[PDB]
Amino acid sequence: DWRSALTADEQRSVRALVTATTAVDGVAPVGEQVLRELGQQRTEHLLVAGSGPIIGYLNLSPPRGAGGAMAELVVHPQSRRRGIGTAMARAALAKTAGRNQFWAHGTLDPARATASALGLVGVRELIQMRRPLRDIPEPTIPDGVVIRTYAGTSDDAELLRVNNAAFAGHPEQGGWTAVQLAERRGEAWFDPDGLILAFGDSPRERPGRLLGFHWTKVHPDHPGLGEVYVLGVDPAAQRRGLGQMLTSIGIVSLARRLKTLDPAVEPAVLLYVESDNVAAVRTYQSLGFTTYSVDTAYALA
């Protein structure tokens, strides 16, 4: 039975399934956007009850922007190999007439095996890379560039202009409106001091225009973990060293934010990047990031 919205109680039950599974598998089974979708009316949901907590959950997001339908799903660790995962995946495939993809975060063995049993193949590879926060860079800020941080909604127009130009065609990051910014500003981890903006200054043709930005994020449920959450440079100002510079500034910012009674943890910064985004992979390789895990999107061949 598909539901177009979930009650507060249903949301609490799905969240418990997701967090419990994250602890057992070592990787969250559904992404952050699915957790935001639990309380909105934009997607469709399947809930599978035991004989009785919720033991299976699938979210199906419809096409939006340049992207197609996408499903994420999870089955309680103690209810696996009972056919629930197959049942939910077949339902989504039948509902979209075989057109949706499925994310397997961390591309764990059970998901690889389920994908083969269903006849699916990997069609998209999202790599998670990490770099320790030791030996931080000294960033070089070129003349004609001034850096500052997010001041509030007066900065949204420029941020959206640069985001949509840099991510034109990106299935999830492109074609944003003020609503996408607002839903992330309401997240517990949002910190205006961690959204770094690079503006053109007098020397350049367009003083005051945003050239690029680096939105950093500190993970709340993982001590010592930061993220290059969104990094983007206006196409008009690309290939001039600004991406490398912005990434370095954000690493410095995170290093500063991440005593005797603090647990010993070697802090690290992670990022996600499409395997075929050549420009970005080169920028990150240059700065010492290395592969950590892979998220694979599966679909009909």
Ligand X SMILES: CC(=O)SCCNC(=O)CCNC(=O)[C@H](O)C(C)(C)COP(=O)(O)OP(=O)(O)OC[C@H]1O[C@@H](n2cnc3c(N)ncnc32)[C@H](O)[C@@H]1OP(=O)(O)O
Ligand Y SMILES: N[C@@H](CS)C(=O)N[C@H]1[C@@H](O[C@@H]2[C@H](O)[C@H](O)[C@@H](O)[C@H](O)[C@H]2O)O[C@H](CO)[C@@H](O)[C@@H]1O
Annotated binding site: which residue ranges? 32, 73-75, 81-86, 172, 217, 227, 231-233, 238-244, 272, 277-282
250 binds ligand X (CB under 6 A): no
> Cα separations (Å) of 291 from 116, 127, 204, 270?
24, 7, 37, 9
Using the structure block, give the residue that is written with the tokens 């004609």: 144
33 binds ligand Y (CB under 6 A): yes
CA atoms 245, 175, 31, 219: torsion sign: positive
Q: Own/partner pairs for 258-265, CB < 8 Å, 24+ apart? A: 258/133, 258/218, 258/224, 258/225, 258/226, 263/223, 265/223, 265/224
241 binds ligand X (CB under 6 A): no
**Among all residues, whose Cβ is closest to ligand X?**
85
The interface partner of residue 298, options being ligand COA, ligand Y, ligand X, none and the CB cut-off 5 to 8 Å by kind, is ligand X
Q: Binding string to ligand COA for residues 257 to 296, with x set by CB under 6 A, is what?
A: ----------------x---x-xx--x-------------
- Among positions 202-261, residues that touch ligand Y (CB under 6 A) are 217, 227, 229-230
Which region, judged by CB under 6 A, interacts with ligand Y, from 30-38, 92-100, 115-123, 201-209? Answer: 30-38
The angle formed by the CA atoms of residues 220, 251 and 235, to the nearest 5 degrees, is 105
239 binds ligand COA (CB under 6 A): yes
Burial string for 211-236 (b: 16+ CB within 10 Å, else e) reads: bbbbbbbbeeeeebbbbbbbbbbbee
CA–CA gap between residue 211 and residue 159 (Å, rounded): 9
From the list 6, 55, 71, 126, which residue makes contact with ligand Y (rule: CB under 6 A)? 126
86 binds ligand Y (CB under 6 A): no
Q: Return residues touching ligand Y (CB under 6 A).
A: 31-33, 103, 126, 172-173, 217, 227, 229-230, 271-273, 295
